Design an enzyme around this catalytic site. Structure first.
Site, mmCIF file in Angstrom:
data_model
loop_
_atom_site.group_PDB
_atom_site.id
_atom_site.type_symbol
_atom_site.label_atom_id
_atom_site.label_comp_id
_atom_site.label_asym_id
_atom_site.label_seq_id
_atom_site.Cartn_x
_atom_site.Cartn_y
_atom_site.Cartn_z
ATOM 1 N N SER A 282 -19.714 -29.603 79.442
ATOM 2 C CA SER A 282 -20.180 -30.009 80.113
ATOM 3 C C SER A 282 -21.903 -29.812 80.598
ATOM 4 O O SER A 282 -22.781 -29.380 80.808
ATOM 5 C CB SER A 282 -20.353 -29.852 82.422
ATOM 6 O OG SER A 282 -20.770 -31.200 82.324
ATOM 7 N N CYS A 348 -23.051 -26.422 89.818
ATOM 8 C CA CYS A 348 -21.537 -27.108 90.467
ATOM 9 C C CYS A 348 -21.023 -26.362 91.874
ATOM 10 O O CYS A 348 -20.806 -25.239 91.478
ATOM 11 C CB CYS A 348 -20.409 -26.138 88.820
ATOM 12 S SG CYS A 348 -19.078 -27.383 89.739
ATOM 13 N N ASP A 389 -19.074 -34.729 75.032
ATOM 14 C CA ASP A 389 -19.021 -33.853 75.228
ATOM 15 C C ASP A 389 -17.743 -32.855 74.798
ATOM 16 O O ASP A 389 -16.470 -33.275 74.468
ATOM 17 C CB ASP A 389 -18.675 -33.081 76.552
ATOM 18 C CG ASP A 389 -20.257 -33.481 77.501
ATOM 19 O OD1 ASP A 389 -20.824 -32.914 77.736
ATOM 20 O OD2 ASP A 389 -19.967 -34.166 78.379
HETATM 21 C C1 HEM Z 1 -15.290 -25.105 84.405
HETATM 22 C C2 HEM Z 1 -15.352 -26.052 84.392
HETATM 23 C C3 HEM Z 1 -16.522 -27.347 85.181
HETATM 24 C C4 HEM Z 1 -17.357 -26.970 84.663
HETATM 25 C C5 HEM Z 1 -18.326 -26.078 83.382
HETATM 26 C C6 HEM Z 1 -18.324 -27.626 85.362
HETATM 27 C C7 HEM Z 1 -19.779 -28.150 85.254
HETATM 28 C C8 HEM Z 1 -21.289 -28.786 86.313
HETATM 29 C C9 HEM Z 1 -22.071 -28.810 85.507
HETATM 30 C C10 HEM Z 1 -22.703 -28.671 84.167
HETATM 31 C C11 HEM Z 1 -23.073 -29.350 87.134
HETATM 32 C C12 HEM Z 1 -24.183 -29.608 87.139
HETATM 33 C C13 HEM Z 1 -24.646 -28.916 88.204
HETATM 34 C C14 HEM Z 1 -26.196 -28.895 88.182
HETATM 35 O O1 HEM Z 1 -26.313 -30.394 88.855
HETATM 36 O O2 HEM Z 1 -27.221 -28.201 87.489
HETATM 37 C C15 HEM Z 1 -21.371 -29.166 87.951
HETATM 38 C C16 HEM Z 1 -21.998 -30.149 88.756
HETATM 39 C C17 HEM Z 1 -20.780 -30.619 90.650
HETATM 40 N N1 HEM Z 1 -19.450 -30.571 89.798
HETATM 41 FE FE1 HEM Z 1 -18.293 -29.162 88.627
HETATM 42 N N2 HEM Z 1 -17.713 -28.071 86.692
HETATM 43 C C18 HEM Z 1 -16.589 -27.645 86.959
HETATM 44 C C19 HEM Z 1 -15.596 -28.280 87.567
HETATM 45 C C20 HEM Z 1 -15.793 -29.177 88.429
HETATM 46 C C21 HEM Z 1 -14.076 -28.957 89.853
HETATM 47 C C22 HEM Z 1 -13.304 -28.361 89.266
HETATM 48 C C23 HEM Z 1 -14.560 -29.264 90.741
HETATM 49 C C24 HEM Z 1 -14.108 -30.177 91.473
HETATM 50 C C25 HEM Z 1 -13.777 -30.029 92.289
HETATM 51 C C26 HEM Z 1 -16.614 -29.693 90.175
HETATM 52 C C27 HEM Z 1 -17.293 -31.011 91.056
HETATM 53 C C28 HEM Z 1 -18.401 -30.783 90.891
HETATM 54 C C29 HEM Z 1 -19.984 -31.331 91.769
HETATM 55 C C30 HEM Z 1 -19.045 -32.301 93.224
HETATM 56 C C31 HEM Z 1 -20.656 -31.290 91.251
HETATM 57 C C32 HEM Z 1 -22.301 -31.986 92.014
HETATM 58 C C33 HEM Z 1 -22.978 -31.311 92.035
HETATM 59 C C34 HEM Z 1 -23.907 -31.324 93.186
HETATM 60 O O3 HEM Z 1 -25.057 -32.067 92.311
HETATM 61 O O4 HEM Z 1 -24.073 -31.007 94.312
HETATM 62 N N3 HEM Z 1 -16.945 -29.544 89.092
HETATM 63 N N4 HEM Z 1 -20.093 -28.847 87.534
#
Ligand code: HEM
EC number: 1.7.1.14
Length: 399
Positions: A282, A348, A389
């Site tokens: 990501s 995240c 990605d």
């Molecule tokens: C290994 C898998 C995953 C990776 C590498 C990943 C990576 C990321 C990254 C790079 C962001 C951006 C964070 C930022 O704004 O600094 C993010 C945001 C987010 N991720 Fe993931 N994620 C993963 C798995 C998950 C899963 C399993 C869920 C859902 C259950 C999830 C839900 C979210 C949500 C809702 C956001 C937004 C958070 C916010 O803006 O407050 N992610 N993730």
């Protein structure tokens, strides 16, 4: 100004541009699909700055926001969920669903994560591969994260397989735009029913918590609940699937480390840490628009200008991670946080859950199948298109 996003140097490699930029022009302008310009930040320190600066905004209605595709510009017109909010709206909504994802909650979820992985592996085992290789993505990498998030949201067991397939259609490169949108709307329709149901008879799931604690008191409306639930579903699922597939390919790529992991599954946590740094699946999620002028390095980013902070590049920043292009599960970690899950308030929400899922996968997979092998030459692995990605579409394996 070069066109951005950049293309990966090869199947498993990040774009070649980043290393060059980190060395000669760490903060530079790139050209987006619509001809607009945006600032690309490539160094770890700068990415962290962009991720936490109160002078920057995640709101997509601000002119200058770096939308990277035509579809991206269109989605920006819908009502936003916390992923696209700034304080205080951001935490106001995020805190509504954070409870399930805290380190403590995830620690307590471990036995469930383990049985989910065990059952899927057993199913993959009994399904066997006597008549040839099976697709590790379809049979394992896809269902693990899918079943877990759906279950957490509230989806009943008998609907998991069908819903997992539909969510996959959303992002499958093979899907036509029509099929992708149809699947999208179908999942939304389904969640709408779940919300109506849980409003009447709440159960122990995220949707019920939203209904009882936020919808009923009038803090948010039914559609809001559906969208928040949808965000939790689609945000990181495809990334999780890719991380699992990428992990298996990487182990195949470096036999010695697979040997070490097999001999000591206790190394799973560190293997996962290196994996999330090395394969930043990501990498286009840290974007902002400057609310007012802000200086970053030797550049001045003016109000209303967009910024894309590459956590993928930051994770290869030679100033923070020695021999950054080397995958080393025994890496000596610096005090600086690898950025696979972002940084700052928006970091995240599922970082702990994601790491728990991966750790469970890599501490169990080779215990179940000690002889698991990619059934095709590693050089022939079917990776995601280079302009997307990093990830793997399918992975034939034998065991
Ligand atoms: C290994 C898998 C995953 C990776 C590498 C990943 C990576 C990321 C990254 C790079 C962001 C951006 C964070 C930022 O704004 O600094 C993010 C945001 C987010 N991720 Fe993931 N994620 C993963 C798995 C998950 C899963 C399993 C869920 C859902 C259950 C999830 C839900 C979210 C949500 C809702 C956001 C937004 C958070 C916010 O803006 O407050 N992610 N993730």
């Amino acid at each position: 100004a070069p066109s951005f996003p950049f293309s990966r140097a090869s199947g498993p490699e990040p774009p070649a541009e980043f290393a060059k930029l980190r060395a000669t022009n760490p903060v530079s302008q790139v050209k987006l699909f619509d001809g607009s310009l945006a600032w690309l930040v490539t160094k770890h320190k700068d990415v962290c700055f962009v991720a936490t600066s109160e002078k920057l905004s995640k709101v997509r209605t601000r002119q200058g926001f770096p939308e990277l595709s035509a579809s991206g510009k269109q989605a920006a017109k819908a009502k936003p969920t916390f992923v696209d909010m700034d304080p205080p709206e951001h935490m106001h909504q995020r805190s509504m669903v954070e409870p399930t994802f805290t380190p403590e909650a995830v620690k307590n979820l471990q036995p469930y994560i383990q049985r989910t992985v065990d059952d899927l592996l057993e199913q993959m085992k009994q399904k066997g591969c006597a008549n040839g290789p099976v697709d590790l993505v379809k049979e394992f990498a896809l269902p693990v994260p899918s079943y877990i998030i759906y279950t957490l949201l509230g989806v009943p067991f008998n609907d998991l397989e069908y819903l997992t397939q539909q969510n996959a259609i959303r992002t499958n490169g093979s899907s036509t735009a029509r099929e992708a949108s149809a699947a999208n709307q179908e999942l939304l329709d389904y969640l709408a029913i779940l919300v109506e149901q849980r409003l009447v008879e709440p159960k122990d799931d995220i949707i019920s918590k939203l209904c009882t604690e936020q919808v009923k008191p009038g803090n948010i409306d039914k559609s809001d609940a559906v969208q928040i639930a949808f965000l939790l579903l689609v945000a990181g699922n495809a990334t999780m699937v890719n991380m699992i597939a990428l992990g298996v390919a990487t182990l195949a790529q470096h036999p010695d480390q697979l040997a070490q992991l097999k001999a000591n599954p206790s190394l799973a946590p560190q293997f996962v840490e290196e994996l999330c740094r090395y394969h930043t699946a990501s990498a286009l999620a840290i974007k902002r628009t400057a609310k007012e002028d802000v200086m970053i390095g030797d550049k001045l980013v003016r109000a209303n200008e967009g910024i894309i902070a590459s956590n993928q590049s930051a994770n290869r920043d030679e100033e923070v991670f020695e021999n950054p292009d080397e995958f080393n599960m025994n890496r000596k970690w610096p005090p600086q946080d690898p950025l696979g899950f972002g940084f700052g308030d928006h970091r995240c929400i599922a970082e702990h859950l994601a790491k728990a899922e991966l750790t469970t996968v890599f501490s169990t997979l080779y215990q179940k199948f000690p002889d698991l092998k990619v059934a095709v030459p590693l050089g022939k692995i079917n990776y995601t298109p280079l302009n997307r990605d990093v990830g793997i579409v399918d992975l034939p394996v034998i065991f």
